[PDB]
Amino acid sequence: XXXTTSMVSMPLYAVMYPVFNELERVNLSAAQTLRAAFIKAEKENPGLTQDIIMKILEKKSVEVNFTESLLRMAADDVEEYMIERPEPEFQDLNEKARALKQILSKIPDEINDRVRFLQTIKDIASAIKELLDTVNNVFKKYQYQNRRALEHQKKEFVKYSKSFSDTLKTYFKDGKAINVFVSANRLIHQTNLILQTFKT
Amino acid sequence: XXXTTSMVSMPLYAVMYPVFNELERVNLSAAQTLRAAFIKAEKENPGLTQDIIMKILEKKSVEVNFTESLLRMAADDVEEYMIERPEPEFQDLNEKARALKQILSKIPDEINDRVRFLQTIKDIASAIKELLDTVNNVFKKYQYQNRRALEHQKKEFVKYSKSFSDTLKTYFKDGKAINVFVSANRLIHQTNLILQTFKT
């Protein structure tokens, strides 16, 4: 009633279609090319999209170990994000930032022990508190020459910090460690943004 | 030494390339079209393949609930696989087959309770034992008119039964229920093959 196509095609519209729509936002060229490529493929062989999606899901450990590597890597070259501005509080910002970025980058090796990891949560929370503590001090004293989109980034950092805490508290419900590594990595990118906005 | 391309592209060759190679076996047309589509896409935006793969992994619950549905469905229309051959042992085969296919199809609702599920493992093992018990009896008494690729299917059923047991014992190590639903579904297809080989 109220109306075709077989049930095995479901994941094309349930899984693949929402991927392409969020992909048309960043690169229409590829998103369009892939869209019709899958559509033609499913008309050829019904259920093929599922077979594809299942094979991707099977490489979970590969993707986990890849994101792990990606998070560890995302602490290298901190000398790229150092400020020229004088003097004391900006050095302190640079430290609190580097410190936090490192603590985060080393999560994939701390998440094994529950004893080590519960300490790291306390350790990250301390680095974030001391990070924002330093930011607001520059926001109160030093004259914000040429720029003040820094405030937007400070708010953006907060959004990614609470999101990190949310996925962290979700980890003690799911067991899905991958979401923690992605969220942690995301937070490092946000830290980098603030730092670069002090430069650019 | 011994040699390019960035690290974010890794999953294209680690995850996507092995998908296409196992896909060229079933449908070269689509596999080829998708291959170059992704390749062009990664040359455009480095890391896009990862973003795609991550979005697919996020729809895990969708894919789990889809495979669940697919397994329950895979017991419908058993009248399609009923034998014309006379008389008593073939009816018994049909029963032992239907019984097993149903027990399997109802796993996604039994896997919640550990008490119900450990019983189902015992219950499936009983249906398989009694299934093979019946097969060998037709293989010993009744004259195998026109066909005897049935023996190949009997061996193929066994291969998918031990594989089911293997992924089942892996479930008590992984917690990944999806592999159980896929393997169970696979075993139903094998059951159907034997039955259809008695017909065709």
From Swiss-Prot, chains A, B:
Ubiquitous. It comes from the Eukaryota. Keywords: Acetylation, Angiogenesis, Apoptosis, Cell membrane, Cytoplasm, Golgi apparatus, Isopeptide bond, Membrane, Ubl conjugation. The modification N6-acetyllysine is found at residue 169. One of its GO terms (cellular component) is Golgi membrane. It is a peripheral membrane protein. It is linked to Cerebral cavernous malformations 3: A form of cerebral cavernous malformations, a congenital vascular anomaly of the central nervous system that can result in hemorrhagic stroke, seizures, recurrent headaches, and focal neurologic deficits. The lesions are characterized by grossly enlarged blood vessels consisting of a single layer of endothelium and without any intervening neural tissue, ranging in diameter from a few millimeters to several centimeters. CCM3 inheritance is autosomal dominant. Belongs to the PDCD10 family. Homodimer. Interacts (via C-terminus) with CCM2. Interacts (via C-terminus) with PXN. Interacts (via N-terminus) with STK25. Interacts (via N-terminus) with STK26. Interacts (via N-terminus) with STK24. Interacts with GOLGA2. Identified in a complex with KRIT1 and CCM2. Interacts with KDR/VEGFR2. Interaction with KDR/VEGFR2 is enhanced by stimulation with VEGFA. Interacts with RIPOR1 (via C-terminus); this interaction is required for the association of RIPOR1 with either STK24 and STK26 kinases and occurs in a Rho-independent manner. This is Programmed cell death protein 10. The gene is PDCD10.
